Enzyme design. Structure first.
Site, PDB file in Angstrom:
ATOM      1  N   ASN A  62     -27.957 -17.350  -8.756  1.00 48.51           N
ATOM      2  CA  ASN A  62     -27.573 -15.995  -8.352  1.00 48.51           C
ATOM      3  C   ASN A  62     -28.808 -15.198  -7.950  1.00 48.51           C
ATOM      4  O   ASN A  62     -28.812 -14.530  -6.921  1.00 48.51           O
ATOM      5  CB  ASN A  62     -26.844 -15.252  -9.483  1.00 48.51           C
ATOM      6  CG  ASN A  62     -25.345 -15.528  -9.508  1.00 48.51           C
ATOM      7  OD1 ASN A  62     -24.579 -14.751 -10.063  1.00 48.51           O
ATOM      8  ND2 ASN A  62     -24.927 -16.637  -8.918  1.00 48.51           N
TER       9      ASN A  62
ATOM     10  N   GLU B  91     -18.372 -11.146 -13.717  1.00 46.47           N
ATOM     11  CA  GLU B  91     -17.816 -12.044 -14.725  1.00 46.47           C
ATOM     12  C   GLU B  91     -18.276 -13.479 -14.567  1.00 46.47           C
ATOM     13  O   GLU B  91     -18.072 -14.092 -13.523  1.00 46.47           O
ATOM     14  CB  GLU B  91     -16.292 -12.026 -14.685  1.00 46.47           C
ATOM     15  CG  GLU B  91     -15.665 -12.779 -15.845  1.00 46.47           C
ATOM     16  CD  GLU B  91     -14.151 -12.719 -15.850  1.00 46.47           C
ATOM     17  OE1 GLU B  91     -13.591 -11.596 -15.823  1.00 46.47           O
ATOM     18  OE2 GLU B  91     -13.529 -13.799 -15.890  1.00 46.47           O
TER      19      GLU B  91
ATOM     20  N   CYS C 109     -18.031 -16.883 -16.977  1.00 48.53           N
ATOM     21  CA  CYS C 109     -17.693 -17.614 -18.195  1.00 48.53           C
ATOM     22  C   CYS C 109     -17.687 -19.126 -17.950  1.00 48.53           C
ATOM     23  O   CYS C 109     -18.039 -19.592 -16.863  1.00 48.53           O
ATOM     24  CB  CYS C 109     -16.322 -17.172 -18.718  1.00 48.53           C
ATOM     25  SG  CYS C 109     -14.930 -17.554 -17.623  1.00 48.53           S
TER      26      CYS C 109
ATOM     27  N   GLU D 117     -10.123  -9.558 -10.226  1.00 46.98           N
ATOM     28  CA  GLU D 117      -9.528 -10.719  -9.564  1.00 46.98           C
ATOM     29  C   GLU D 117      -8.228 -10.411  -8.833  1.00 46.98           C
ATOM     30  O   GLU D 117      -7.173 -10.925  -9.192  1.00 46.98           O
ATOM     31  CB  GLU D 117      -9.268 -11.818 -10.588  1.00 46.98           C
ATOM     32  CG  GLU D 117     -10.519 -12.349 -11.242  1.00 46.98           C
ATOM     33  CD  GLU D 117     -10.228 -13.525 -12.135  1.00 46.98           C
ATOM     34  OE1 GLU D 117      -9.665 -13.322 -13.228  1.00 46.98           O
ATOM     35  OE2 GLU D 117     -10.550 -14.659 -11.735  1.00 46.98           O
TER      36      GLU D 117
END
Ligand SMILES: *[C@H]1O[C@H](CO)[C@@H](O)[C@H](O)[C@H]1NC(C)=O
Length: 497
Positions: A370, A340, A342, A235
């Site tokens: 996705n 990632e 979450c 990030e």
């Protein structure tokens, strides 16, 4: 095989209890003859990846929704599925008795479990650590002579990784991502907050950072662990936000471009780890397709980038067509990977919701979206957390598929775990996504893929409350008559020959 031991904590569904001597598990896979299909079902009402079998007839008794397989319409090939072996996850796992530990590890990587084949490894500390640190905190050591691995890697992370691959049903690939670099290499000399590397790409600073990746890879190599890829930075856009709490290292899209081209790429390509893949972005997909255009349109940089890694939560909302979709169009040969994913941050929601079916649906739905938009792989966040959503030296804000209750030598498998399993367990690496045409508008989320051995796999998610009649057609076999119960998730498997 052993069934799920249900437990409720006041949420929509239940968790599966597991202790030192008991944990729900699957029997070795056995694929049925042509004309027969296998169904694995999970429902908010309790059922957890229950197996059942049925026929695929040449007759079509269904008059509702029809999903036809189009094996000829081929797309991306899957890299795999996994989670992050953060300091927090390792401390929680290592807090259970050795016997319990193995049941947890088998739950994830074993054939008795859901077959994870990917593990994201943080490079030093991140927010899910009980202390701030880097692999080289001793100031002005640009040649990284004092670079070393702390107890977190040598005693916690590494041993668990070895144990994971041992139990591993399939070859597991390792993915590494840095959060922050030594503070002396940063503009603000802090582990967090608005700050980027000092100077510009090419100088001793950026070269020192590049070397750092090699040092990490060597240290792990010394420990008999080789990686498959690394992200340019975790990030990076976060390191541009004044007062960012978690460890970071900001890079503007231009800065990452010059960094890959000038330092990271060359340094990696000139090391014994030249075969390690480099993934860019590794941030929120809202940054696409822009970040992609800035980096990939520069040959000096693009030649080092194997793929684009994305994060994006679930509690929030984003448009896949404008982000993942557009990026694939503009750059069809640069794979998209979810590094990632979450969830559980809504300011009003509890960080960890034991038994939340909604959060599970957010995972399967997000995984399906996705897949429908070219993503080749999925990497969950923390492999395990405590009931408070920790340990996290800054603040708990996300859930995890497995929650460890240290004081009772037991751990819980959330709906999240099984929703992930509906994919990770039946989509081996090498599988290729294929066409699946809906006969009419419907409320289901579906995706079809073809195993490397040619067999078919189809996941059907029903986020509605109403049961949905459904017929699945494989032109080579026939019609599969079934029903997608409200609030359920199915996975069908069948031979095509
Ligand atoms: C947990 O495992 C099984 C499943 O409920 C249970 O019978 C057993 O008593 C529990 N473990 C211990 C030793 O408390």
């Amino acid at each position: 095989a052993r069934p799920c031991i249900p437990k409720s904590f006041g949420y929509s569904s239940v968790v599966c209890v597991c202790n030192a001597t008991y944990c729900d598990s699957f029997d070795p896979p056995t694929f049925p003859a042509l004309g027969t299909f296998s169904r694995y079902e999970s429902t908010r009402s309790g059922r957890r990846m229950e197996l059942s079998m049925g026929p695929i007839q040449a007759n079509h008794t269904g008059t509702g929704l029809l999903l036809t397989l189009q094996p000829e319409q081929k797309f991306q090939k899957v890299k795999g599925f996994g989670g992050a072996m953060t300091d927090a996850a390792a401390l929680n796992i290592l807090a259970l008795s050795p016997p319990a530990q193995n049941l947890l590890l088998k739950s994830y990587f074993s054939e008795e479990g859901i077959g994870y084949n990917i593990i994201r490894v943080p490079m030093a500390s991140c927010d899910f650590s009980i202390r701030t640190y880097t692999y080289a905190d001793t100031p002005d050591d640009f040649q990284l002579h004092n670079f070393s691995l702390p107890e977190e890697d040598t005693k916690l992370k590494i041993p668990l990784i070895h144990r994971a691959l041992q139990l591993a049903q399939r070859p597991v690939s390792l993915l590494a991502s840095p959060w922050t670099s030594p503070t002396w290499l940063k503009t603000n000399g802090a582990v967090n907050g608005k700050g980027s590397l000092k100077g510009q790409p090419g100088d001793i600073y950026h070269q020192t950072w590049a070397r750092y990746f090699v040092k990490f890879l060597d240290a792990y190599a010394e420990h008999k662990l080789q990686f498959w890829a690394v992200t340019a930075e975790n990030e990076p856009s976060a390191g541009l936000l004044s007062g960012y709490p978690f460890q970071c290292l900001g890079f503007t899209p231009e800065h990452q471009r010059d960094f890959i081209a000038r330092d990271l790429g060359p340094t990696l390509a000139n090391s014994t780890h030249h075969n390690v893949r480099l993934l860019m972005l590794d941030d929120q997909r809202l940054l696409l397709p822009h970040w992609a255009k800035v980096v990939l349109t520069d040959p000096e940089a693009a030649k080092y980038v194997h793929g684009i890694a994305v994060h994006w939560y679930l509690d929030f909302l984003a448009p896949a067509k404008a982000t993942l979709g557009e990026t694939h169009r503009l750059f069809p040969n640069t794979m998209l990977f979810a590094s990632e994913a979450c969830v559980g941050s809504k300011f009003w929601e509890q960080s960890v919701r034991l038994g939340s079916w909604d959060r599970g649906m957010q995972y399967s739905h997000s995984i399906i979206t996705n897949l429908l938009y070219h993503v080749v792989g999925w990497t969950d966040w923390n492999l395990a957390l405590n009931p408070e959503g920790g340990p996290n030296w800054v603040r708990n804000f996300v859930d995890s598929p497995i929650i460890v209750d240290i004081t009772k030598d037991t751990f819980y498998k959330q709906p999240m775990f099984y929703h992930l399993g509906h994919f990770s367990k039946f989509i081996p690496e090498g599988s290729q996504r294929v066409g699946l045409v809906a006969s009419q508008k419907n409320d289901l989320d579906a995706v079809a893929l073809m195993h490397p051995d040619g067999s078919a796999v189809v996941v059907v998610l029903n986020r509605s409350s109403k049961d949905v009649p459904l017929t699945i057609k494989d032109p080579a076999v026939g019609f599969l008559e079934t029903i997608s119960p409200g609030y359920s998730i199915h996975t069908y498997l069948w031979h095509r020959q």
